[PDB]
Design a protein around this ligand. Structure first.
Ligand SMILES: CC[C@H]1OC(=O)[C@H](C)[C@@H](O[C@H]2C[C@@](C)(OC)[C@@H](O)[C@H](C)O2)[C@H](C)[C@@H](O[C@@H]2O[C@H](C)C[C@H](N(C)C)[C@H]2O)[C@](C)(O)C[C@@H](C)C(=O)[C@H](C)[C@@H](O)[C@]1(C)O
Ligand SMILES: O=c1ccn([C@@H]2O[C@H](COP(=O)(O)OP(=O)(O)O)[C@@H](O)[C@H]2O)c(=O)[nH]1
Length: 393
C-alpha cells in the first residue's frame, strides 16, 4: 500500500537501496521517501514521493572526517539528529499514515514512528549486521571504557530517556543495533561470522542495481590472455607510489594486459614512458571491465569487493583505509584473494601473486560457488519480494 522509506543525506545510505524503491513503485505501491532537501531530486528519480525534513548531520558532499573520529563522536550525532527530526516526520505522516516503514539503519525516527503506527518496519543495511554473539563479543568491550565515562553514561541515559518518552522500553543498544526485520545489501560472503547471523531476522540480498555489467562498451584487446584491472573506486585513488608500481609488475609481461586508472583530465604525468600493454584512464566502466577481466587489484571497498565476487574475478586486496582491512581479510579467507600491505607490494610480489591467483582452478572453484550463492540472494526484485511479504494485508 503506502510504503514510506526513510534515510539521511549520505550517498552510502541512499544509493544502496534506490533500485528496490523503484521496484516497489514499479509494482504499483505508493512509495514516499523521507530525506533532507539535498537528496530530494535523487530519490524522486525513482517515482518515490520525497518528504522533506531538516537534518543536522554533515552534508553528502561534506568531508568524511566531519562524521567524527571517536566512538562517542560517531554515535552521538545520530541521536541528536533523531531528536529534532522525529517531530518533523511525525507531523508529515499524520495526514497520510504509511502502511509499511522502510528505513536505512541510520534513521532512528523511522524506528520510533513505525512503532507509533503499529506497522511493520523493515531495516535496510548497506553493511554487515550483528550476529548472534555480537553484544557480548563486540558491543560490550567496545563500550566498556567510554560508557564508563561521565560523557558515555550521560549519552546512554539521554538515549534511554528519549526512548521512554516515546513509549519504548527497549535499551538503546537493542533499539539501535537489533532490528526485528532486516534486509542486508551486501553479499553474505562479506559478513563476519556468517552462520551465526539470525536468518529469521536478517535476509541477505546483496547488491541491487546492474550486475552485469554497468556500463560502458569496453573491449578486451585481441591477443589478451590475462586482463588485470587496477581500479580503486572513485575515492581512495590519489597514490603516487602505487600505480607506477602496478605498471612495473605487469608492463611488458607477455600475455597480460593492464587496465590502469588514476583520475584527472589530465594528468598521466607524474611520470612513466609506459609499456605497450598498459592502458591508463581517469575512470572506467568498472563492472563492465571486471566482466571480462581475469584479475582485480582492489582496495577492497564494499563496491569493488562485491563486484569482484559478482564477476568471479580473483583479487589482490591492497587495503588502504577504514573501508578495507576486514573486507580484505574476508576475501582472503574465502580463498579467492591475497591481501597485501601497500608498502610490500613489489613488482615481483604483485606479479608472483597475480600469476598464483589466475592459474588456480580451485580459486576459480571458490568464486563460482560464491556467484551461485549471490544469485540466490537475488538482487533488487528479490529485495522487493521480501518487502512485499512484510507489507501487511
Ligand atoms: C553492526 C550494527 C551496527 O552497524 C555498525 O556498527 C556499522 C558497521 C557502522 O560502520 C562502522 C564502519 C565504518 C567504516 O562505517 C562504514 C566506520 O566509519 C563506522 C564508524 O563504523 C555504522 C555503519 C556506522 O555508520 C557510519 O558512521 C560513520 C561515522 C559515518 C558513516 N557515513 C555516514 C559516512 C556511517 O556509515 C554507525 C556510526 O555505527 C551507524 C550508527 C547509526 C550506529 O551506531 C548503528 C546503530 C550501528 O551501531 C549498527 C547499525 O547497529
Ligand atoms: O573508476 C571507477 C571507480 C569507481 N567505480 C565504481 O565506483 C564504486 C566505488 O565504490 P567502492 O566501495 O568500491 O570504493 P569507494 O570509492 O567507496 O572507496 C564501485 O561501484 C565501482 O565499480 C567505477 O565504476 N569506475
Amino acid at each position: 500500500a503506502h510504503i514510506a522509506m526513510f534515510s539521511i543525506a549520505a550517498h552510502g545510505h541512499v544509493n544502496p537501496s534506490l533500485e528496490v524503491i523503484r521496484e516497489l513503485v514499479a509494482r504499483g505501491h505508493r512509495v514516499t521517501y523521507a530525506i533532507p532537501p539535498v537528496f530530494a531530486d535523487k530519490v524522486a528519480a525513482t517515482g518515490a514521493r520525497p518528504v522533506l525534513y531538516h537534518s543536522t548531520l554533515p552534508g553528502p558532499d561534506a568531508d568524511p572526517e566531519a562524521w567524527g573520529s571517536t566512538l562517542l563522536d560517531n554515535v552521538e550525532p545520530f541521536l541528536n539528529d533523531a531528536i529534532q527530526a522525529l517531530p518533523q516526520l511525525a507531523d508529515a505522516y499524520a495526514d497520510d499514515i504509511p502502511d509499511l516503514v522502510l528505513h536505512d539503519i541510520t534513521s532512528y525516527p523511522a524506528r520510533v514512528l513505525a512503532r507509533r503506527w503499529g506497522v511493520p518496519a523493515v531495516s535496510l543495511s548497506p553493511n554487515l549486521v550483528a550476529w548472534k554473539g555480537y553484544e557480548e563479543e563486540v558491543a560490550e568491550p567496545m563500550w566498556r571504557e567510554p560508557r564508563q565515562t561521565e560523557r558515555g553514561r550521560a549519552y546512554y541515559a539521554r538515549f534511554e530517556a528519549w526512548l521512554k518518552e516515546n513509549g519504548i522500553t527497549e535499551h538503546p543498544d537493542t533499539f539501535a543495533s537489533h532490528p526485528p526485520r532486516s534486509l542486508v545489501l551486501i553479499p553474505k560472503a562479506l559478513q563476519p561470522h556468517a552462520d551465526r547471523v539470525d536468518e529469521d531476522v536478517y535476509t541477505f540480498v546483496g547488491a541491487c542495481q546492474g550486475d552485469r555489467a554497468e556500463e560502458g562498451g569496453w573491449q578486451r584487446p585481441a591477443g589478451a590472455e590475462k586482463v588485470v584491472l587496477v581500479s580503486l573506486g572513485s575515492a581512495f585513488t590519489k597514490q603516487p607510489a602505487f600505480y607506477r608500481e602496478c605498471v612495473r609488475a605487469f608492463g611488458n609481461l607477455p600475455g597480460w594486459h593492464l587496465v590502469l586508472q588514476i583520475g584527472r583530465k589530465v594528468t598521466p604525468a607524474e611520470l612513466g614512458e609506459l609499456p605497450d600493454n598498459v592502458e591508463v584512464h581517469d575512470w572506467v566502466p568498472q563492472l563492465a571491465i571486471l566482466r571480462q577481466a581475469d584479475l582485480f587489484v582492489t582496495h577492497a571497498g564494499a563496491g569493488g569487493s562485491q563486484e569482484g565476487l559478482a564477476t568471479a574475478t580473483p583479487m589482490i586486496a591492497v587495503p588502504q583505509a577504514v573501508d578495507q582491512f576486514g573486507n580484505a581479510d574476508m576475501l582472503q579467507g574465502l580463498g579467492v584473494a591475497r591481501k597485501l600491505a601497500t608498502e610490500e607490494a613489489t613488482a615481483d610480489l604483485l606479479r608472483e601473486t597475480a600469476l598464483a591467483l589466475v592459474d588456480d582452478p580451485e580459486v576459480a572453484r571458490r568464486l563460482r560457488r560464491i556467484q551461485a550463492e549471490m544469485a540466490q540472494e537475488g538482487g533488487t526484485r528479490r529485495a522487493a519480494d521480501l518487502i512485499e511479504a512484510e507489507l501487511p494485508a
